[PDB]
Design a protein around this ligand. Structure first.
Ligand SMILES: Nc1ncnc2c1ncn2[C@@H]1O[C@H](COP(=O)(O)OP(=O)(O)OP(O)(O)=S)[C@@H](O)[C@H]1O
Lengths: 33, 51, 49, 195, 425, 319, 127, 57, 38, 63
């Protein structure tokens, strides 16, 4: 059960990481714009 | 740095990640498992003593 | 442009459509309500058979 | 066949890894008048064991091949005279646990034709509607009879069936009309015809 | 490729603009008078205002009566209903022969009905019922998502099709027809192996209204309304389990359908295309059938009827002693216009044989063609055209690509005509 | 009882007779009508009650068989154009079927480039015909969605095809984990064609690339080729309401991470074989021991007494 | 044109509380592990597939047809059971497409398309 | 017979009974003429919608 | 209270004897007036 | 194990009356052996076995 909890947190971490890289791309685009 | 890459884009393309399923709960379960041992055997697993 | 569309797939110029039946509205048969009251027969004339 | 003395699962630390409750056999103790035998079944038989209301003291039949448990009832030893339920208490099976030997039944090709032409169909809409309509005799097609011929040939090749061709006695054959004799021409020239 | 039948060579009546028959054209040779009369009848059918007009093709066998009828059919085109029929088809085990004749009359009258088709198609996002007057169903396409309130009938058809969610469905509101054509494409990647087929989500609107032209006959409406298949009520469902026998449709159903069709014609949503009923071997009809045709041809709704008979003074069937000219009662012959087909000269037979050879892809030498024409003069036209395919087969066996006279002689010796066979009998 | 069989075929020597019916069952009635209704103003109460009773009773009687009763008696009001007509209507798709089957067996991945959105829909149908998984990147996809979809294709080798529009913007998608590129058609304007060619060459920067172009023989398509010069918020609001423990877990898993694989998971395969063989031997030994115990049980005289009614009532004759 | 997967069952695991499962099939040349959807799990459960069964699975319908019991797994259990006769392991790829020819007569098509369960009239002659 | 029929739902509280002999307990002597054929056809098949399966009759 | 999609109004229906006895021959005998299965 | 209700108690017949029928209490043994001789014809057996509800043909004649 604790492993399932940590895997759920891992999913959240992965989605947040993807969203943060996407926002990094957006910030670079706005900066060069 | 390597934690930034995506299991691709990496020159040393490591083998067979394929990230399998995490199962994630189905509560108490009954497993039916048939395997080759020349011969075939079935093992039925009960998750908990209640079931 | 049209010829290229035909070369890609003829379904771009004319699709194949599902074949359908013609749905005809039910025929309304009008008649008097007294017709259904035929064969009723009077209570106090029907015995227990 | 026998009365269920015991239903015990054989537990093992067997699996291909796993912290669960594993069984590799289901021990069924079957008791007939002759003796008792302990059968060890595929663990998958646990499903039909409780799908059927199989407990200790129940009379059961375990198809050697099909492997399907089948609760005939309860043993009549566990049957007081003060119990009203009936068609539940069956006598203890006689003889050995392991026996049903050979059932031999004699049919005609017409019986197979009729059976396969209109299925019994007593389970669904077929049941009520077909029974409610009158069961008329139908003109069975040559396709059905050819299929029956193929099936009977395969049964004979497997040794499950023996063909005993008989004789048809048409008395008052003069009562047949010209159409009937003309058909008899073709019916008498088939390799499947009787005498 | 297409199979060659006995009439595959007829592509029309071969008439010029003024209606005069070209000696050979559209696969027909000779019978110029009959072809011109058939052109007049084609114009009659195209005029579309005359009902219950009957023509009789009279002539010995082999003269091309059925060929001329099919030439009329070719002239009309696939748009106009051409119902072919044989006199032997009236004797049905289920319905009276009068009913068979009336049904054939009704299916020679065609309708082109423009119908608005209400289509709901999309991925089932949700399926929520409300006690059971409702089903709230969400449908997703490329264009967008919509949720719709549908009848219990559509819900219960959806349960019939077993659509749960992520399933691509196609609902026709008019008929209450639901099609589960698969699961959405987005769910293919879920599993390595799943037991269903995935279909891309619809790319159009969820709610699409489409105008389509439907080709139906009056008989289609009669049969649909006499054996109803729409509606989901239990009473009609249990009637669907009955053996679908043909029933003697009453004049009341036909009058009601006439009223409905007239309303459609007024509304502009339908157009009537009355066709032609072709009864070949009309001599097979008994006296009762002809006497019914007396009335069936007076109807203002009747189609154009074409009869063909090769009999000379046959007894009328069912009368047991009454000899009428074409096996047809005189009172019916008073209602028809007779088109007579004449026998063929040797040259016309040779032309027909060449046309049949061309249609069957057979090369025949001039010597072989002349010999086969001589045989046909001696035996019959039908016999000669039948020799062509076996003769070509023998020619291929010999390794030649054309029919020479020796092959025709061989096939003539191997097979017999009715006259030779009768001689040996 | 009576006999019965299913081994009976119809004409083919084959499958389960519902597939046969489905294969050949296609006719639809030209006209479908609901049964005529009796339009009576204020129908009598007795008649209406009788009809209601009959309808109610018939239901709840067919209720156990209602699904079956409906599968039967349900007319075919619709017949659709079968999926095989796609790939038969077009020779391009006929050749692409062979190409993609070979590429599937060889293990390569493919991205199909077509200018037409509608031909992309037709390609979706065609790919489902072959049970080939894909991802669709269109003009209508935003740049974020384009990147997300191409990235999902890169991640997953279980999806075989990338369906991409020559009219979409290939801005940031530089890495495509595919070996071969299929041009279903040549764009009519050199601007988009040139941009697509540059994108393919960019894909061809690393590792080898196979580019396929479909050209229809004896068509204007053949002539035109070989010339043509005649001229974020969701993560946020989801990150909120993340109770304290999970915010901590977020920080911890951010900094410390993990790795399930250790490059020696293969030992689990060999370890599992060893465990299975050892269990087979243990089971065999336990079975032999149980059989020895059963024989030892049989050794003792199983019968010592009998019953009284089976003792003083002569019970049998030697015969 | 059908698409079947035909292989020897060397492993099948079904987890049941929606059901989860995994299935490994092998030809002489290759082995593949399939993650099973609910419909496929139901098909396998209905057809009672074990290790050592040679089966073919239709990709469209998911129909399971078992051709026998295989060379490798072969013998099966140490339970009641019955006698044994074994077939060969399939060769080549698991998915092999393949084109099958089905023959009917015009009369069969007429009978099937006429009566909504008119197929049984192909035997009873009740058309 | 124990047979019951609800003659109406007079919206006073759609038919209400008259009052010549408007008693609750009503009994009078009835004569019904029936032919033997009527009895035969009544006994030829079940009485219709009362029974589980005679409903399909 | 019959429901259907500004005064009492009167309706005249002429029904043939055949219609009357076909309607009353079966539960849904009015269908036989169209199918002829009377 | 078939239950057949044949009547209501003898403690009322006491305000009732319906399809019901009134019977007085059985006397003697609760459990009784009983010999019943059924008279039929071969035709009756034939039509009973002809179909599932074939006994109805003894009335309608629809054999
Ligand atoms: N004038 C014609 N031109 C071309 N083919 C013809 C002509 N007349 C007859 N035929 C054909 O020759 C063959 C025999 O004629 P059919 O029309 O089939 O038989 P039939 O003699 O018309 O039938 P009936 O009713 O006895 S006259 C068929 O292949 C016809 O197409």
């Amino acid at each position: 059960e604790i492993e399932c909890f940590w895997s759920n947190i891992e999913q959240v971490v992965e989605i947040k990481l993807r969203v943060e890289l996407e926002e990094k791309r957006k910030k670079a685009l706005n900066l060069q714009k | 740095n390597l934690r930034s890459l995506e299991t691709y884009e990496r020159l040393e393309a490591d083998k067979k990640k394929q990230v399998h399923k995490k199962r994630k709960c189905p509560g108490p379960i009954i497993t039916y498992h048939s395997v080759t041992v020349r011969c075939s055997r079935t093992f039925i697993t009960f998750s908990d003593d209640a079931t | 442009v049209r010829l290229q569309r035909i070369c890609n797939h003829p379904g771009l110029v004319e699709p194949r459509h599902p074949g359908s039946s013609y749905v005809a509205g039910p025929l309304e048969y009008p008649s008097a309500s007294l017709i259904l009251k035929a064969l009723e027969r009077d209570f106090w004339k029907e015995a227990d058979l | 066949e026998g009365e269920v003395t015991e239903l015990t699962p054989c537990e093992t630390e067997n699996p291909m890894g796993g912290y669960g409750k594993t069984i590799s056999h289901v021990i069924i103790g079957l008791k007939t008048a002759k003796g008792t035998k302990q059968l060890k079944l595929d663990p998958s038989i646990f499903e039909s064991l409780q799908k059927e209301r199989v407990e200790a003291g129940d009379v059961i039949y375990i198809e050697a091949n099909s492997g399907a448990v089948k609760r005939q009832g309860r043993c009549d030893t566990y049957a007081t005279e003060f119990d009203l339920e009936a068609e539940e208490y069956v006598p203890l099976p006689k003889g050995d646990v392991h026996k049903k030997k050979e059932i031999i039944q004699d049919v005609t090709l017409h019986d197979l034709d009729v059976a396969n032409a209109r299925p019994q169909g007593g389970q669904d809409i077929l049941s009520m509607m077909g029974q409610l309509m009158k069961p008329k005799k139908t003109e069975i097609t040559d396709k059905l009879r050819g299929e029956i011929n193929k099936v009977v040939n395969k049964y004979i090749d497997q040794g499950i069936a023996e063909l005993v061709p008989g004789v048809l006695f048409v008395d008052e054959v003069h009562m047949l009309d010209i159409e009937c004799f003309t058909y008899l021409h073709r019916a008498l020239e088939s390799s499947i015809a009787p005498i | 490729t297409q199979r060659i039948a006995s009439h595959s060579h007829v592509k029309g009546l071969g008439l010029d603009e003024s209606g005069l028959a070209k000696q050979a054209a559209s696969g027909l040779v000779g019978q110029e008078n009959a072809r011109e009369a058939c052109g007049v009848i084609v114009e009659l059918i195209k005029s579309k205002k005359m009902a219950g007009r009957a023509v009789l093709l009279a002539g010995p066998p082999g003269t091309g009566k059925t060929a001329l009828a099919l030439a009329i059919a070719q002239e009309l085109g696939s748009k106009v209903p051409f119902c072919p029929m044989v006199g032997s088809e009236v004797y049905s085990t289920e319905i009276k022969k009068t009913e068979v004749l009336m049904e054939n009359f009704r299916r020679a009258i065609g309708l082109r009905i423009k119908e608005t088709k209400e289509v709901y198609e999309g991925e089932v996002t949700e399926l929520t019922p409300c006690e059971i007057s409702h089903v709230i169903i969400g449908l997703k396409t490329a264009k967008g998502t919509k949720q719709l309130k549908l009848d219990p009938s559509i819900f219960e058809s959806l349960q019939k099709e077993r659509v749960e969610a992520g399933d691509v469905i196609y609902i026709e509101a008019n008929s209450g027809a639901v099609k589960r054509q698969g699961r959405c494409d987005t769910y293919a990647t879920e599993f390595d192996l799943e037991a269903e087929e995935y279909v891309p989500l619809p790319k159009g609107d969820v709610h699409k209204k489409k105008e389509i032209i439907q080709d139906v006959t009056l008989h289609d409406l009669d049969v649909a309304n006499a054996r109803p298949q729409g509606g989901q009520d239990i009473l009609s469902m249990m009637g669907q389990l009955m053996k679908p026998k043909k029933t003697e449709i009453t004049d009341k159903l036909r009058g009601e359908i006439n009223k409905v069709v007239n309303k459609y014609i007024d509304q502009g949503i339908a157009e009537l295309v009355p066709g032609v009923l072709f009864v070949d071997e009309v001599h097979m009809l008994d006296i009762e059938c002809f006497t019914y045709l007396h009335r069936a041809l007076e109807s203002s709704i009747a189609p154009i009827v074409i009869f063909a008979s090769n009999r000379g003074n046959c007894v009328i069937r069912g009368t047991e002693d009454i000899t009428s000219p074409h096996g047809i009662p005189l009172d019916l012959l008073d209602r028809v216009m007779i088109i007579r087909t004449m026998l063929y000269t040797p040259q016309e037979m040779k032309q027909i044989i060449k046309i049949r050879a061309q249609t069957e892809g057979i090369n025949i030498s001039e010597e072989a063609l002349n010999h086969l024409g001589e045989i046909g003069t001696k035996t019959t036209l039908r016999y000669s055209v039948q020799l062509l395919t076996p003769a070509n087969l023998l020619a291929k066996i010999n390794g030649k690509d054309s029919i020479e006279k020796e092959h025709v002689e061989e096939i003539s010796e191997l097979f017999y005509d009715a006259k030779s066979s009768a001689k040996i009998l | 009882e009576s006999p019965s069989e299913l081994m009976l075929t119809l004409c083919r020597c084959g499958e389960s007779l519902q597939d046969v019916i489905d294969r050949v069952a296609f006719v639809i009635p030209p006209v479908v009508a609901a049964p005529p209704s009796l339009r009576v103003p204020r129908p009598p109460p007795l008649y209406s009650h009788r009809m209601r009773i009959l309808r109610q009773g018939l239901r709840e009687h067919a209720a156990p068989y209602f699904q079956q009763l409906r599968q039967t008696t349900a007319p075919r009001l619709l017949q659709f154009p079968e999926l095989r007509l796609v790939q038969f209507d077009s020779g391009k798709l006929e050749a692409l079927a062979i190409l993609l089957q070979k590429l599937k067996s060889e293990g390569r991945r493919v991205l199909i480039l077509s200018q037409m959105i509608l031909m992309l829909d037709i390609l979706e149908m065609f790919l489902n015909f072959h049970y080939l998984t894909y991802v669709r990147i269109d003009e209508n996809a935003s740049s974020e969605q384009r990147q997300e979809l191409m990235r999902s294709f890169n991640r997953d080798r279980r999806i075989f095809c990338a369906i991409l529009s020559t009219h979409s913007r290939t801005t940031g998608i530089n890495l495509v984990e595919a070996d071969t590129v299929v041009f279903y058609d040549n764009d009519l304007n050199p601007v988009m064609d040139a941009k697509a060619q540059e994108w393919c060459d960019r894909i061809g920067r690393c590792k080898d690339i196979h580019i396929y172009r479909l050209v229809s023989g004896n068509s204007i398509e053949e002539k035109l080729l070989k010339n043509g010069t005649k001229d974020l918020e969701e993560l946020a609001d989801f990150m909120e309401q993340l109770t304290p423990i999970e915010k901590y877990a977020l920080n911890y898993l951010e900094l410390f991470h993990t790795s399930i694989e250790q490059e020696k998971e293969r030992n689990s395969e060999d370890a599992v074989m060893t465990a299975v063989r050892a269990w087979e031997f243990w089971n065999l030994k336990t079975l032999q021991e149980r059989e020895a115990r059963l024989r030892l049980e049989q050794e003792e005289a199983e019968l010592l007494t009998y019953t009284r009614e089976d003792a003083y009532s002569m019970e049998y004759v030697y015969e | 044109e059908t698409e079947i997967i035909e292989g020897e069952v060397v492993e099948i695991q079904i987890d049941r509380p929606s059901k989860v499962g995994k299935l490994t099939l092998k030809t002489t040349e290759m082995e593949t592990i399939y993650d099973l959807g609910t419909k496929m799990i139901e098909s396998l459960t209905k057809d009672k597939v074990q290790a050592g069964d040679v089966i073919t699975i239709d990709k469209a319908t998911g129909k399971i047809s078992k051709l026998g019991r295989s060379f490798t797994r072969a013998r099966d259990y140490d339970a009641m059971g019955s006698q044994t006769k074994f077939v060969q392991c399939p060769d080549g790829e698991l998915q092999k497409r393949k084109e099958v020819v089905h023959t009917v007569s015009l009369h069969e098509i007429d009978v099937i398309n006429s009566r909504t369960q008119g197929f049984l009239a192909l035997f009873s002659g009740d058309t």
